[PDB]
Design a protein around this ligand. Structure first.
Ligand SMILES: OCCN(CCO)CCO
Ligand SMILES: O=C([O-])C(=O)[O-]
Ligand SMILES: O=C([O-])C(=O)[O-]
Ligand SMILES: [Cl-]
Lengths: 232, 231
């Protein structure tokens, strides 16, 4: 499997025998979906980033308010066999051959996250056609470099060191329910293509048993999942 | 920001469950660059080009970890535990930023060199005969997403602190270790990479950094300098 996906909160702070250089144990996200996708060669970009860079979009539906969202881009994936309970697989990814899945294409991901204009599941597809909301991380956030399995995180402002101090937090400081768009691109000589897995993790405040995010590269299909999600 | 922390197998902490690993105390990151078409140092699986990295370990250790990452991109000013090869330095940024493979097959084989001035010649001889454990022969055929190949002692205690009470004969021996690395098609061993080599010493035992080089003669020069230095 993939490496564990960790929030920015520190669970333990054990100072290693003698050496003042210490070891902080991060708290893992309680709710993680790994989305396995595939960008076919010459596939048109979903959009443009930084003027001229080909960007591709994933859409995430977050149904309750959260403490944090973490996003990791790993590529390529190779074959993974039968997906597990935490895994989702794109059609393109299914149809892709083992060889196709095992070809590397890029390494450093520029990730942008933007909240879209959608108060309700049923606005998702039009929200996707619409401009993002025009503030803090739950409206806009960008990490221009993501290498070696690092994350892009959407955080509340002024987060405490102790995860447990989120018990106290005011609702109005938490990240809002809604539709978020992940844009990803790269730098030459890389190009965004082939297999990849976007791990998305949510952190809920202490005592709130989480719900999993819904994720899809297709806003109509996510919307159906989200429309169906709310009336089940 | 550099590389992820290189972790040993020893569990430092456990809780609510996910476990926190003890880092290696003595770590060196070897930034290298395999030139297009470069002749293999040897063959693996009847159809794979393998490349060799030589590690000298002067004293007994509790564990060694090897992580292979590729490509690296540009890295900025090398830090206090970074070795950077001339090939890597001569490579362009574009060259170091192109990926070429993602799944590494690693072997670690001990070579028959009891002292520094055997190193160069030992590299030319077969590995020590491989039960003999991890510190003679170890292989991990798949290393993806920054996973490690570890050379471990057999029947280790749960608690690292209990290593202070271990019999010496159980610890991993001093010597010359060859790291082989190759890959599966469609990838190929090409371009930039960083091999992170971590040592775990038993507690109370000050770490000594591993000496690492792709050229055994060069490694031998360094091992020799280090040894005669200690008188
Ligand atoms: O062609 C199949 C051989 N295969 C190794 C088996 O996993 C790929 C190596 O390049
Ligand atoms: O296939 C996919 O999932 C994509 O295009 O992002
Ligand atoms: O650059 C190097 O040292 C190599 O190929 O191992
Ligand atoms: Cl010894």
């Amino acid at each position: 499997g993939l490496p564990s996906l960790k929030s920015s909160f520190v669970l333990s702070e054990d100072t290693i025998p003698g050496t003042n250089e210490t070891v902080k144990t991060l708290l893992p996200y309680g709710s993680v979906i790994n989305y396995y996708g595939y960008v076919k060669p010459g596939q048109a970009p979903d959009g443009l980033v930084d003027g001229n860079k080909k960007a591709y979009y994933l859409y995430v539906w977050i149904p309750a308010v959260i403490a944090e969202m973490g996003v990791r881009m790993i590529s390529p994936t190779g074959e993974i066999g039968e997906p597990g309970d935490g895994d989702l697989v794109s059609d393109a990814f299914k149809a892709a051959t083992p060889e196709e899945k095992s070809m590397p294409h890029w390494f450093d991901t520029w990730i942008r996250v933007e909240r879209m204009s959608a108060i309700m599941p049923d606005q998702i597809a039009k929200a996707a056609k619409a401009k993002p909301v025009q503030d803090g991380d739950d409206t806009y956030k960008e990490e221009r470099h993501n290498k070696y399995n690092s994350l892009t995180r959407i955080k509340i402002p002024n987060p405490p060191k102790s995860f447990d101090d989120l018990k106290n937090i005011d609702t109005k400081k938490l990240l809002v329910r809604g539709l978020y768009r992940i844009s990803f691109t790269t730098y030459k000589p890389g190009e965004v293509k082939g297999s990849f897995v976007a791990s998305v993790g949510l952190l809920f405040p202490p005592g709130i048993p989480g719900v999993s995010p819904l994720i899809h590269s297709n806003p109509e299909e996510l919307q159906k999942q989200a429309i169906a999600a709310e009336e089940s």
